[PDB]
Curated annotation (Swiss-Prot), chain A:
Underlying gene: Sfmbt
Compartments (UniProt record): Nucleus
Parent sequence residues shown: 1137 to 1204 of 1220
Organism listed in the record: Drosophila melanogaster
Top-level taxon of the source organism: Eukaryota
Domains (record comment): MBT repeats have unique discriminatory binding activity for methylated Lys residues in H3 and H4; the MBT repeats bind mono- and dimethylated H3K9Me1, H3K9Me2, H4K20Me1 and H4K20Me2 but fail to interact with these residues if they are unmodified or trimethylated.
Domain SAM positions: 5-68
Primary role: Polycomb group (PcG) protein that binds to the Polycomb response elements (PREs) found in the regulatory regions of many genes. PcG proteins act by forming multiprotein complexes, which are required to maintain the transcriptionally repressive state of homeotic genes throughout development. PcG proteins are not required to initiate repression, but to maintain it during later stages of development. They probably act via the methylation of histones, rendering chromatin heritably changed in its expressibility.
Protein name: Polycomb protein Sfmbt
Curated annotation (Swiss-Prot), chain B:
Sequence intervals crossing the membrane: none
The organism's place on the tree of life at top rank: Eukaryota
Range within the parent protein: 803 to 877 of 877
Gene name of the record: Scm
Domain remarks: The SAM domain is essential for function.
Identification of the protein by name: Polycomb protein Scm
Species whose genome carries this gene: Drosophila melanogaster
Length: 69, 78
């Protein structure tokens, strides 16, 4: 259940969904489950170096996460 | 030559340039933002103008181009 996830939980989620590249930024900023599910795009933008493509991809992945849940 | 969602960044650029020569200028912009096929289909006018810095004109033209190939996804619009 994502709301239970810690920082490590978020890293692995990012890993198995081919977003390995962003794990370390996510860790450094201590993005655990709770914060994950709170994230807006405005928040996601600087976490990915102000890059729209990755930002949208991550936003989509989280949205999908929120679906089966 | 392929599903839009399977496009590389360069192939996205190729699409936009060959349909509108006026957008060739925005090549490097797409590269910076790493807009491949999947990213392209996920775009919206908001993200374009807010975060990619595109003007109304270009943004509209790009919205149109995406609309031609994004299937039954919602039409992008300003």
């Amino acid at each position: 259940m994502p709301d239970t996830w810690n920082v490590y939980d978020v890293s692995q989620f990012l890993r198995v969904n081919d977003c390995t590249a962003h794990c370390d930024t996510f860790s450094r900023n201590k993005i655990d489950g709770k914060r994950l599910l709170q994230l807006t795009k405005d928040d996601i933008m600087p976490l990915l170096g102000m890059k729209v493509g990755p930002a949208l991809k991550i936003s989509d992945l989280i949205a999908q996460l929120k679906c089966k849940v | 030559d392929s599903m839009p969602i399977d496009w590389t960044i360069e192939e996205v650029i190729q699409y936009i340039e060959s349909n509108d020569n006026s957008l060739a200028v925005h090549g490097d912009l797409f590269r910076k933002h790493e807009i491949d096929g999947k990213a392209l289909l996920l775009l919206n006018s908001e993200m374009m103008m807010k975060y990619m810095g595109l003007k109304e004109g270009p943004a509209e033209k790009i919205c149109n181009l995406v609309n031609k190939v994004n299937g039954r996804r919602n039409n992008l619009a300003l």
